[PDB]
């Protein structure tokens, strides 16, 4: 992926995360905890659905018989028709291959981008109160309970409240 | 110390897809874009089909026994079959494929009399090759003959004006007797000449005694235009002419009809029913179809790269 | 205390465009990629046009009265009209559409006498369908017939060598008389056969009496190569042959000409003047044209995503 | 887009920024002020122009008539021609739709990228003298007058000059 | 590129780096040194290889003769063939030009991405021990010898080991 | 003490094109359009047939030029410019359709149709086809009356295809030098030839005055019968043809070379390439890269080149 998050600095995905595409996992004095993030999950699915809306359910042009299976037309016209049919097949097989390969490249990078953006969102949210682990985690330098973990997840965390406690925990 | 970790979901067994960079990279989910599922049926729901069976598409114009039930028909989906046959007496149509192509998209045909009446000649020429209940002939045509063996056929003119607001499909035949004496038997002795003339068409025909065949020719006669026939024998006269109804799709297949499924894309082996952009079923299709590709499968990723443990 | 913010521009209402993942997303500015503006005229500025009017393109070769003014012409833009006609006497050109395609890109035609003189026959064959300074005939053709009614038309041979460095367009006609009686009156009784041979062409023709008809046939005669005509009647002889001038475009249209605009792309509805890669005006075009597409509009984003103040 | 600046961490665009694509809005004791960034703006315009040059003004392909609109040709060959023309129409309509959709996708992300670059450039510029507030602003931890703001915009800001004042304003502990 | 490293905040490339696409140039008390990085170089090379795997060595479908050089075919069909061929050529000419242009755009951005990834990895490694100067360099705020520089390249760099020294060096006036 | 990150560069970079830029410089690039032609027909691994003076359709009827190719077997048929189908004036109807089915035939095998005659002559010959004196097409029989101006008897000849594959049936109509000539070789009065199989029926009349023999053909299904009925001006098949398998047909002036492999052929030789495109020839046969108008289309295989 172009952004280096998914299959990058984040080791692996979570099989337990059944509720969404992206999420948070926290450890504190109360234990483990996993919760899915709605916004980034919905952003990614909307973009995947948009690709599908483009490719699936297209209106097609009508094409008629220019041949005759039961009454062979002169081989001269038949071979011309066949050359053209094969030439069309060549183009569409090329286009399809390229379209799918190109879309898949974009889909993978798009999802990697969403992970990165959420990671960046949290980083800026935590300010001076945390340091990044390098593996997708933030080492928080203040006591942070389940209510505190929730405030981070839904963008209501106030860094000012913990700045003094965090800064002295960071400077030792 | 306390920590919060960000991450993404994964599955135990993902789906291998192709990118510009990698072949067989695993993603969470993928969806097929190439239709491979065929229906071995002609899906005719919401459509008015005509399965011509033993009747050849050109036969609907002249009327051999096999085409009696299709002399006038109305449909938006005309299905031709391998066993379909145009003629009963040996002979052919001039520019047959061109004629077949306009008939397939006609929406069927309506027939109208041309008001041709004859006297001083016979009208009931028949052959064992076209049997209805004994020797018969093309239902839409008249095999004109002299009053008796070796009698002179009269020089005849027959004109027909198209009274409708659409082109009339005018058909006529030329009889090539099995011998010179056979031509003398049915018509007068001497050279026979058939001229067919409209304001956009002019052609003359001479019989070729010995060929034992009836060759059919055709024109499209514009509204208000007149087609004039001049002949002195060997002339297979039209009794009726055809008018097209509207729009239809022509199909060639061996697949049975099925009115319980809907479909817009037809081929030799039936119907392709799909919303997918591409199909790998048949390169030769008719109707509104996904584009044919040579790949069996092209999977579109619908999820992120899959990385599990 | 003090702070500095980074940001980008926006507008009140932007333009909807399509992307791979989203339909109708709004951007600051977009530009049209599909041309829909048609000029209902043939733009002939910078060009030497030839409006054929009542004369058919193939008529310029054989010379019916309506084509008198086009027997020889030079142009890079040939305009065909619906009322154009190739013939006076009933008849068809074999391979007529191939010949039209050739003439459309020829740059025009120049005529040269084939030097055919005749003995023991008449040359003054004529019809009231091609009336012009007398009940005449096709201007580039000679209607050959016997010296008197019913006289035997001599077995004849005429050869022509192309003396130029470019292909000669050779035309001839086979006359199909109104009746067997007429054919005997004009060319004498018996079988009639016409043979035309060059180094890369050989065909025989028999008249088909019954329908008043003069059917025209043609070949391209290579430089230095000879065309040979052997015949015993029912033959319409070429008096002149044609030579092409260079390069041109051929249009079928009813749109009037306009010399005050330049165009390189033409169709039946007129002219497409555009630098866009695509057009939705007409699928049948001639010249240097944008590709025909079925979409009415495809907007190309020329700015960022538009995010107005909520 | 892919980079999360435009329609991402930056809430909205500035309708008052009429002299560029990207800009700075500052706040100090002297007041407010907005100035466009030329370098980032031109970089985005040059790339967009590049796409335009590749599509508009391009040399067209040569076309000739194979059909006849007045004296219709034989039905068989005419149907082959029509089939082929419609197949061309199908390919070109597909190509056109895809080209524009792909280009538009890249144009949006490209613009998003330039905003991201300019942001990250200023961040590195300010060093330890400022903090990101998450909305695309940097809160500066020293007095930064109009000329100080100017040095940031024109890339001459020397972080050494203010580091001492900044650090004792940021680190508010012993 | 989209990522702003190559031809961006990193001024220029190094002609002296011949053992890879990306790498590290360090300055300390022992002098300077330059070492290439296998991981990001290989990741870039493999992705470009993948692109070549797609375009090179394709299986092609068979086409037969439909016209005749030595004896001209009927002129109407010849014109249709020629008209069809030109149309084919235009499509393939368009496709080839678009493919190359699109692939190259992605290739450049891809390499830019790999440079950015490596930079961001090293930033996370050094934690609070280093400050970035804006030109792609990290100012290490402690004595970091050749063997210490090694560990940064090797991903074995323990930041806790130098944290106290570097922190008090960053605070001093 | 500092650690700096960076990337490689070269002095001489390659200019390539992208979506946003023209002639942008990269570290390295690879050509995608093939321009190297081989001025040879590469026939290694193949069984080739260089027809030379013999026209492809001539192999069916057998003029002097084609005596070497009455039965040939190959997977690569090379037609030459100086190839000729006939000796006596005339042509094949649907000639190109016949050429196209022959080019992929894999060669032809010949089988006797087993026609015997009495009451007529079968030894017709012309100085136009010399093969040690006057002769005729080696696979055909020129049927005449027993003597000058003698009546040619009404005749019927039938042949059933015994093999498990279609039979190529050729016959000819002789259009005499004159009306006098026709009655000399055959009887007086109108001549008619009718040819019938269970899915083909056609009659032919001669066209006296235009000295020529025109050949006509049909494909006869296994277990089906051709019937010839004729009273003169008829050129009879002595042998019918059966296709051997599969072949590719090429038109070229390029010499054969058995020392190189190739699968893409054109008038100017062979295109050997793994590249997706080629700028050598727009008209090719076999398995080829696609033809493009561009001479060069370089694919970047390296990053942007930024020198100091
Ligand atoms: C053009 O292609 C069609 C479709 O393949 C050919 O028709 C088929 O011929 C093959 C091989 O002889 C058979 O297996 C099929 O049964 C035929 N029919 C269909 C409907 O597939 C046709 O022969 C080709 N035209 C020419 C002139 O070769
Ligand atoms: C091929 O397509 C053309 C145009 O789509 C057909 O000609 C047109 O037919 C329509 C509807 O019947 C007429 O109103 C137009 O006047 C025709 N010409 C044009 C230029 O639009 C044509 O009939 C088709 N070919 C065949 C053989 O059916
Ligand atoms: C730059 O790319 C070229 C291809 O354009 C590479 O050339 C190939 O190099 C190998 C040797 O390593 C040869 O075996 C091939 O024959 C070459 N192929 C072609 C098409 O020339 C070259 O390796 C690259 N240069 C560098 C320095 O990496
Ligand atoms: C926006 O694009 C249009 C073309 O659609 C053009 O007229 C104009 O120059 C562009 N710029 C602005 C600021 O409107
Ligand atoms: C088609 O193109 C070939 C080769 O360019 C040319 O020789 C020929 O004249 C063209 N055919 C017709 C019928 O115009
Ligand atoms: C994803 O796509 C597959 C195949 O198209 C589909 O069957 C499945 O329901 C989808 N998976 C999930 C988890 O929704």
PDB file of C-alpha atoms in Angstrom, chain D residues 2-99:
ATOM      1  CA  UNK D   2      -6.264  10.043  -0.179  1.00  0.00           C
ATOM      2  CA  UNK D   3      -4.265  12.549   1.884  1.00  0.00           C
ATOM      3  CA  UNK D   4      -6.916  13.759   4.328  1.00  0.00           C
ATOM      4  CA  UNK D   5      -6.226  17.489   4.143  1.00  0.00           C
ATOM      5  CA  UNK D   6      -8.863  18.834   1.726  1.00  0.00           C
ATOM      6  CA  UNK D   7     -12.281  17.631   2.944  1.00  0.00           C
ATOM      7  CA  UNK D   8     -10.314  15.955   5.749  1.00  0.00           C
ATOM      8  CA  UNK D   9      -8.662  17.588   8.767  1.00  0.00           C
ATOM      9  CA  UNK D  10      -9.147  21.025   7.206  1.00  0.00           C
ATOM     10  CA  UNK D  11     -12.867  21.693   7.794  1.00  0.00           C
ATOM     11  CA  UNK D  12     -13.626  23.793   4.710  1.00  0.00           C
ATOM     12  CA  UNK D  13     -12.195  26.090   2.043  1.00  0.00           C
ATOM     13  CA  UNK D  14     -11.812  29.854   2.204  1.00  0.00           C
ATOM     14  CA  UNK D  15     -14.081  31.611  -0.285  1.00  0.00           C
ATOM     15  CA  UNK D  16     -12.105  34.790   0.462  1.00  0.00           C
ATOM     16  CA  UNK D  17      -8.866  33.227  -0.817  1.00  0.00           C
ATOM     17  CA  UNK D  18      -9.196  34.549  -4.375  1.00  0.00           C
ATOM     18  CA  UNK D  19      -5.498  34.891  -5.262  1.00  0.00           C
ATOM     19  CA  UNK D  20      -4.453  31.244  -4.981  1.00  0.00           C
ATOM     20  CA  UNK D  21      -5.346  27.607  -4.394  1.00  0.00           C
ATOM     21  CA  UNK D  22      -3.553  27.376  -1.034  1.00  0.00           C
ATOM     22  CA  UNK D  23      -2.945  29.977   1.655  1.00  0.00           C
ATOM     23  CA  UNK D  24      -2.132  31.017   5.203  1.00  0.00           C
ATOM     24  CA  UNK D  25      -4.507  32.652   7.659  1.00  0.00           C
ATOM     25  CA  UNK D  26      -2.820  34.077  10.751  1.00  0.00           C
ATOM     26  CA  UNK D  27      -3.881  35.595  14.061  1.00  0.00           C
ATOM     27  CA  UNK D  28      -1.728  37.774  16.316  1.00  0.00           C
ATOM     28  CA  UNK D  29      -1.791  40.941  18.458  1.00  0.00           C
ATOM     29  CA  UNK D  30      -1.936  43.000  15.237  1.00  0.00           C
ATOM     30  CA  UNK D  31      -5.011  41.156  13.924  1.00  0.00           C
ATOM     31  CA  UNK D  32      -6.030  38.748  11.157  1.00  0.00           C
ATOM     32  CA  UNK D  33      -4.547  38.262   7.682  1.00  0.00           C
ATOM     33  CA  UNK D  34      -4.737  35.938   4.683  1.00  0.00           C
ATOM     34  CA  UNK D  35      -2.048  35.474   2.017  1.00  0.00           C
ATOM     35  CA  UNK D  36      -1.885  33.017  -0.891  1.00  0.00           C
ATOM     36  CA  UNK D  37       0.975  30.551  -1.354  1.00  0.00           C
ATOM     37  CA  UNK D  38       2.331  30.926  -4.885  1.00  0.00           C
ATOM     38  CA  UNK D  39       4.683  27.912  -4.989  1.00  0.00           C
ATOM     39  CA  UNK D  40       2.133  25.260  -3.965  1.00  0.00           C
ATOM     40  CA  UNK D  41      -0.597  26.851  -6.111  1.00  0.00           C
ATOM     41  CA  UNK D  42       1.545  26.902  -9.279  1.00  0.00           C
ATOM     42  CA  UNK D  43       2.717  23.343  -8.682  1.00  0.00           C
ATOM     43  CA  UNK D  44      -0.906  22.160  -8.698  1.00  0.00           C
ATOM     44  CA  UNK D  45      -1.841  24.312 -11.715  1.00  0.00           C
ATOM     45  CA  UNK D  46       1.154  23.056 -13.744  1.00  0.00           C
ATOM     46  CA  UNK D  47       0.091  19.426 -13.202  1.00  0.00           C
ATOM     47  CA  UNK D  48      -3.556  20.134 -14.087  1.00  0.00           C
ATOM     48  CA  UNK D  49      -2.440  22.076 -17.194  1.00  0.00           C
ATOM     49  CA  UNK D  50      -0.336  19.012 -18.075  1.00  0.00           C
ATOM     50  CA  UNK D  51      -3.490  16.870 -18.127  1.00  0.00           C
ATOM     51  CA  UNK D  52      -5.260  19.466 -20.279  1.00  0.00           C
ATOM     52  CA  UNK D  53      -2.347  19.537 -22.755  1.00  0.00           C
ATOM     53  CA  UNK D  54      -2.577  15.762 -23.052  1.00  0.00           C
ATOM     54  CA  UNK D  55      -6.300  15.806 -23.965  1.00  0.00           C
ATOM     55  CA  UNK D  56      -7.231  19.199 -25.462  1.00  0.00           C
ATOM     56  CA  UNK D  57      -5.764  20.252 -28.817  1.00  0.00           C
ATOM     57  CA  UNK D  58      -4.583  16.693 -29.502  1.00  0.00           C
ATOM     58  CA  UNK D  59      -4.207  15.668 -33.157  1.00  0.00           C
ATOM     59  CA  UNK D  60      -7.454  14.006 -34.253  1.00  0.00           C
ATOM     60  CA  UNK D  61      -7.673  10.804 -36.313  1.00  0.00           C
ATOM     61  CA  UNK D  62      -8.577  10.925 -40.023  1.00  0.00           C
ATOM     62  CA  UNK D  63     -12.156   9.949 -40.953  1.00  0.00           C
ATOM     63  CA  UNK D  64     -13.735   8.912 -44.263  1.00  0.00           C
ATOM     64  CA  UNK D  65     -17.248   7.808 -45.248  1.00  0.00           C
ATOM     65  CA  UNK D  66     -17.870   4.108 -45.904  1.00  0.00           C
ATOM     66  CA  UNK D  67     -21.647   4.598 -45.794  1.00  0.00           C
ATOM     67  CA  UNK D  68     -24.047   6.360 -48.142  1.00  0.00           C
ATOM     68  CA  UNK D  69     -26.783   8.517 -46.600  1.00  0.00           C
ATOM     69  CA  UNK D  70     -28.617   9.279 -49.862  1.00  0.00           C
ATOM     70  CA  UNK D  71     -28.282   6.101 -51.943  1.00  0.00           C
ATOM     71  CA  UNK D  72     -28.218   3.391 -49.261  1.00  0.00           C
ATOM     72  CA  UNK D  73     -25.772   0.528 -49.897  1.00  0.00           C
ATOM     73  CA  UNK D  74     -26.622  -3.210 -49.896  1.00  0.00           C
ATOM     74  CA  UNK D  75     -28.065  -4.354 -46.561  1.00  0.00           C
ATOM     75  CA  UNK D  76     -25.505  -7.091 -45.760  1.00  0.00           C
ATOM     76  CA  UNK D  77     -22.343  -4.997 -46.007  1.00  0.00           C
ATOM     77  CA  UNK D  78     -24.276  -2.046 -44.527  1.00  0.00           C
ATOM     78  CA  UNK D  79     -25.087  -4.106 -41.441  1.00  0.00           C
ATOM     79  CA  UNK D  80     -21.457  -5.198 -41.040  1.00  0.00           C
ATOM     80  CA  UNK D  81     -20.486  -1.499 -41.230  1.00  0.00           C
ATOM     81  CA  UNK D  82     -23.154  -0.493 -38.684  1.00  0.00           C
ATOM     82  CA  UNK D  83     -22.104  -3.296 -36.310  1.00  0.00           C
ATOM     83  CA  UNK D  84     -18.449  -2.186 -36.486  1.00  0.00           C
ATOM     84  CA  UNK D  85     -19.314   1.504 -36.060  1.00  0.00           C
ATOM     85  CA  UNK D  86     -21.446   0.758 -32.984  1.00  0.00           C
ATOM     86  CA  UNK D  87     -18.646  -1.426 -31.568  1.00  0.00           C
ATOM     87  CA  UNK D  88     -16.277   1.546 -32.017  1.00  0.00           C
ATOM     88  CA  UNK D  89     -18.824   3.817 -30.323  1.00  0.00           C
ATOM     89  CA  UNK D  90     -18.968   1.340 -27.415  1.00  0.00           C
ATOM     90  CA  UNK D  91     -15.164   1.221 -27.008  1.00  0.00           C
ATOM     91  CA  UNK D  92     -14.714   5.006 -27.284  1.00  0.00           C
ATOM     92  CA  UNK D  93     -17.605   5.790 -24.923  1.00  0.00           C
ATOM     93  CA  UNK D  94     -16.058   3.387 -22.416  1.00  0.00           C
ATOM     94  CA  UNK D  95     -12.572   4.880 -22.886  1.00  0.00           C
ATOM     95  CA  UNK D  96     -13.902   8.425 -22.533  1.00  0.00           C
ATOM     96  CA  UNK D  97     -15.894   7.661 -19.374  1.00  0.00           C
ATOM     97  CA  UNK D  98     -12.945   5.827 -17.793  1.00  0.00           C
ATOM     98  CA  UNK D  99     -10.304   8.400 -18.776  1.00  0.00           C
TER      99      UNK D  99
END
